[PDB]
Amino acid sequence: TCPFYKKIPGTGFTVDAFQYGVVEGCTAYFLTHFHSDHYAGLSKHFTFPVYCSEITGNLLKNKLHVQEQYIHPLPLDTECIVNGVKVVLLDANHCPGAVMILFYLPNGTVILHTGDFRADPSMERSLLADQKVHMLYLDTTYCSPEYTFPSQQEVIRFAINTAFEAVTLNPHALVVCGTYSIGKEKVFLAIADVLGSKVGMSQEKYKTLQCLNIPEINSLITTDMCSSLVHLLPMMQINFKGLQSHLKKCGGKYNQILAFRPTGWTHSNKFTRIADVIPQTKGNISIYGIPYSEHSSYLEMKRFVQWLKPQKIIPTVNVGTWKSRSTMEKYFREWKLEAGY
């Protein structure tokens, strides 16, 4: 049974609710972004209308084989009418194709569902700025003050300089980057660009990246591993055993691996600055964990909510424990009292 916080009252609508079978009274199923916890349940046999971004619709069609007739892509930043209700899709600053959804209810209520997002001050000048929002369905993944991490730009700077230094010192070093889903493509694209290489990867990964509308992509990626000095691998293979095994397969082209694991937050963030990060090393293999987040930090979240001034907040993440729920409700009340709404 679909939980309440995936339902949009006063509509026939659900958000990211594909694992519950046929939801009673749902006339249109919205998908915020192509991540498995959200899409769970979609497949080629789905016969209800799905509303999403153009990128998300590319992935539904090519990766999950949903039939075209049921995929309804919408342009961003544009007022659209779906089953007699006005909606707008906004960029979520999450993974490619990820959106927030504004719903304009027939009774005058205005609802924002953030899906998964990284709040940014640039959002304060989207179509949100022009009207009041009564209810906010909020991505609360890192809704606690201990969650700090750097900007995405500083993290990319760290990785570029790290990889460029290592490979200039040793031209026979291979760089490997871990991946398990879409998002965080900047990590491996930025590194390959500084090294003047393409990024090499499996045919299944190449296919997924071809759905994303990234400019000049045929110039940046490839399935020819032999021609590339930045390789992508499954995240599970980013360990000493997996990387040694991969270095065997490269046929004496390389004698050193430098690898990156983009994580979200890790407790080394409560002590260490990005500048100060060090790898784990064993022989000729080094592994850096880098805190490249596609979710709001605590401070970024607080600023967005205090700017938006919603009347009611409904969390969509960390909802399974009473301790988590109680913690989030405390911060929401603090924020409301400090800002005065």
Binding site residues, Ni ion, CB under 5 A: 35, 116
Distances (CA, A) of 118 to 212, 295, 296: 19, 4, 4
Q: Looking at beta carbons only, is 60 or 175 nearer to Ni ion?
A: 60
Q: Looking at beta carbons only, is 228 or 293 nearer to Ni ion?
A: 293
Q: Looking at beta carbons only, is 97 or 310 nearer to Ni ion?
A: 97
Give the three-state DSSP class for 221.
Answer: strand
Q: Judging by beta carbons within 10 Å of its beta carbon (0-12, 13-18, 19+), is residue 31 exposed, middle or buried?
A: buried
Q: Looking at beta carbons only, is 34 or 103 nearer to Ni ion?
A: 34
Q: Looking at beta carbons only, is 116 or 176 nearer to Ni ion?
A: 116
Nearest residue to 71 (alpha-carbon basis) of 39, 103, 110: 39
**Minimum separation from the CB atom of position 45 to Ni ion (A):** 24
**Minimum separation from the CB atom of position 337 to Ni ion (A):** 31
**Minimum separation from the CB atom of position 36 to Ni ion (A):** 9
C-beta separation of 54 from 80 below 8 A: no
**Minimum separation from the CB atom of position 79 to Ni ion (A):** 26
**Minimum separation from the CB atom of position 34 to Ni ion (A):** 9
Distances (CA, A) of 53 to 73, 74, 251: 5, 5, 42
Element housing 328 (H / E):
helix 322-339
How many other C-beta atoms can be found within 10 angstroms of the C-beta atom of residue 143? Answer: 22
- Going edge to edge, which strands form the sheet with 71-73? 7-8, 13-15, 28-30, 50-52, 71-73
Q: Looking at beta carbons only, is 35 or 184 nearer to Ni ion?
A: 35
